């Protein structure tokens, strides 16, 4: 009713790359011809023309995204987008994500001849990929600040403390100094900012000052991740401006955490464009919604993060088509579910894992990943510690560190306390993974 192209080779478009390739999981309502569903599905990704037509009755086709290949009973639909249908900036000339989603998960995700359609992968030529922002920093910049080679600097360990909201300016400050003590990265957690109890500038003013203190105490260079997430661009520069004013002396140490799935793209381009060489930290928030695996209309989690290496993000949560992510964001040259991609300059976006990541299974994380340059936010290997927080991530550093160098964790953990207590913290984790740990460690 217009649209499609199946004679066309995926790897042609790949080459004279004046076109975006999208790959989806879509099943039609049931009683409609697959190609009809997908020649359609691309009508609302392109020109529409919505019937047949020609605009000024000139060839408003060569704008037109045509399904380049489909596998009916594999629930698959690959569509090739000409680059021209993509919006750029006027005072700028750059690509913007805001057009790439409106184009591919906009009206798209509403059609009635579709049941679900899930994006599984994408391809961004040269042409187009390079009209985009890219991570301004990475972990590199954190390596700069902690005094680690900005090439295989490695893991930043944190903690999270509890609770997410509640402690006050000072009950807060201090919790954070105390963990500044057995790790290096502390986040204000997603919700955290200007609640009445505990205010932005009362509380940013004292974390500020608890880093003078920890970083002065220990004599290591502690990093913070302060949330400058707002509705208005002006309150995201202003939240963040005072942050780096108040931090004065130490704003190389300050990161900029934004709740970016729940904020949006202009909130992430404010932090990234108005605060270019500061790390802007994305907090995928109310995003299960879509990316989570048994919701079938998302952008899949892998598709989420690829999307954010393109747009300025320096960091993003997880790892642990979801072990590919970790490659899709760091390596410029790597295979996603269907399409290999070139980053041909663009700078990683960092994997910033979490959770029950422990000390006995850390080393396996770092082998099946291969790079140990992730940011590890702990509640797990941390509060799980039988010697609490403080020593919970100071057993974490150990675990990673054992690893670059080459020492078998049961005996690295044989030279220091933090890691020999990990083993007596986790069951048999220590029984699963670590052969008779009871004998060769202590007991």
Q: Which residues are catalytic?
A: 162, 283
Residues forming a β-bridge with 81: 20
**189 touches its own copies by CB under 8 A:** yes
**48 touches its own copies by CB under 8 A:** yes
Contact by Cβ (8 Å): 318, 287: no
Contact by Cβ (8 Å): 284, 317: yes
Q: Which residues make Cβ contacts (< 8 Å) with residue 410, sequence separation at least 6?
A: 423, 434, 435, 437, 440, 441
Query: Which 244-273 positions form the footprint of its own copies (CB under 8 A)?
Result: 259, 261-270, 273
**192 touches its own copies by CB under 8 A:** yes
Count Cβ atoms within 10 A of the Cβ of residue 415 and give its class: 0-12 exposed, 13-18 middle, 19 or more buried. Answer: exposed
Phi, psi of 366 (to 5 degrees): -85, -15
Query: Which 314-373 positions form the footprint of its own copies (CB under 8 A)?
Result: none
Q: Which is nearer to its own copies, 94 or 323 (CB)?
A: 94
Contact by Cβ (8 Å): 409, 420: no
Identified binder of its own copies from the candidate list 96, 255, 316, 372, rule CB under 8 A? 96
**18 touches its own copies by CB under 8 A:** no
**290 touches its own copies by CB under 8 A:** yes
| Secondary structure (DSSP) of 388-431 | HHHHHSTTHHHHHHHHTTT--HHHHTTT-HHHHTTTTTSTTTTT
Q: Which is nearer to its own copies, 16 or 62 (CB)?
A: 62
Number of residues that bind its own copies (CB under 8 A): 109
Phi, psi of 226 (to 5 degrees): -100, 125
Binding characters for its own copies, 52-81, by CB under 8 A (x = yes): -xxxx-xxxxxxx-----------------
Residues forming a β-bridge with 13: none
Specify the length of the chain in residues: 443
Q: Which range in 66-74, 288-296, 328-336, 345-353 contacts its own copies by CB under 8 A? A: 288-296
Identified binder of its own copies from the candidate list 49, 252, 321, 371, rule CB under 8 A? 49
**92 touches its own copies by CB under 8 A:** yes
Q: How far is the CB of 85 from its own copies (least distance, A)?
A: 5
**111 touches its own copies by CB under 8 A:** yes
Q: How far is the CB of 219 from its own copies (least distance, A)?
A: 27
Q: Which range in 45-53, 134-142, 338-346, 365-373 contacts its own copies by CB under 8 A? A: 45-53
**215 touches its own copies by CB under 8 A:** no
Token code pair at residue 54: 């020609």
Angle 66-70-75 (CA atoms, 0-180°, nearest 5)? 130
Q: How far is the CB of 276 from its own copies (least distance, A)?
A: 12
């Amino acid at each position: 009713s217009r649209y499609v192209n199946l004679a066309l080779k995926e790897e042609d478009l790949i080459a004279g790359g004046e076109h975006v390739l999208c790959a989806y999981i879509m099943k039609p309502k049931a009683g409609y011809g697959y190609v009809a569903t997908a020649a359609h599905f691309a009508a609302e990704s392109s020109t529409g023309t919505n019937v047949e037509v020609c605009t000024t009755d000139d060839f408003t086709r060569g704008v037109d995204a045509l399904v380049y290949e489909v596998d009916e009973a594999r629930e698959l639909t690959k569509i090739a987008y000409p680059v021209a249908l993509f919006d750029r900036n006027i005072t700028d000339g750059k690509a913007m994500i805001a057009s790439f989603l409106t184009l591919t998960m906009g009206n798209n995700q509403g059609m009635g001849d579709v049941e679900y359609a899930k994006m599984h992968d994408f391809y961004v030529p040269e042409a187009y990929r390079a009209l985009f922002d890219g991570p301004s920093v990475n972990i590199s910049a954190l390596w700069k600040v902690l005094g680690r080679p900005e090439v295989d600097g490695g893991l930043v360990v944190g903690t999270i403390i509890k609770p997410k909201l509640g402690l006050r300016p000072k009950p807060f400050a201090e919790a954070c100094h105390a963990f500044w003590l057995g790790g290096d990265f502390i986040k204000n957690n997603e919700p955290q900012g200007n609640q009445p109890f505990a205010p932005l500038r009362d509380t940013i003013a004292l974390v500020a000052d608890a880093m003078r203190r920890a970083q002065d105490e220990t004599g290591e260079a502690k990093l913070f991740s302060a949330n400058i997430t707002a509705d208005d661009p002006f309150e995201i520069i202003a939240r963040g401006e005072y942050v780096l004013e108040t931090f004065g002396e130490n704003a190389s140490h300050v990161a900029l955490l934004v709740d970016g799935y729940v904020a949006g793209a202009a909130a992430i381009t404010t932090a990234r464009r108005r605060f270019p060489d500061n790390f802007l930290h994305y907090h995928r928030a109310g995003h299960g919604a879509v990316t989570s695996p048994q919701s079938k209309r998302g952008y899949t989690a892998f598709v989420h993060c690829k999307m954010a290496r393109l747009q300025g993000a320096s960091g993003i949560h997880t790892g642990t088509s979801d072990r590919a992510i970790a490659y899709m964001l760091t390596q410029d040259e790597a295979q996603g579910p269907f399409y290999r991609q070139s980053w041909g300059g663009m700078k990683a976006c960092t994997p910033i894992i979490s959770g029950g990541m422990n000390a006995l299974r850390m080393p396996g994380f770092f082998e099946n990943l291969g790079n140990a340059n992730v940011i590890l936010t702990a509640g797990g290997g941390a509060f799980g510690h039988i010697d609490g927080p403080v020593a919970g991530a100071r057993s974490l550093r150990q675990a990673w560190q054992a690893w670059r160098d080459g020492v078998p964790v049961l005996d690295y953990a044989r030279e220091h306390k933090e890691l020999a207590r990990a083993f007596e913290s986790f069951p048999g984790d220590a029984d699963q993974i670590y052969p008779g740990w009871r004998k060769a460690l202590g007991v």
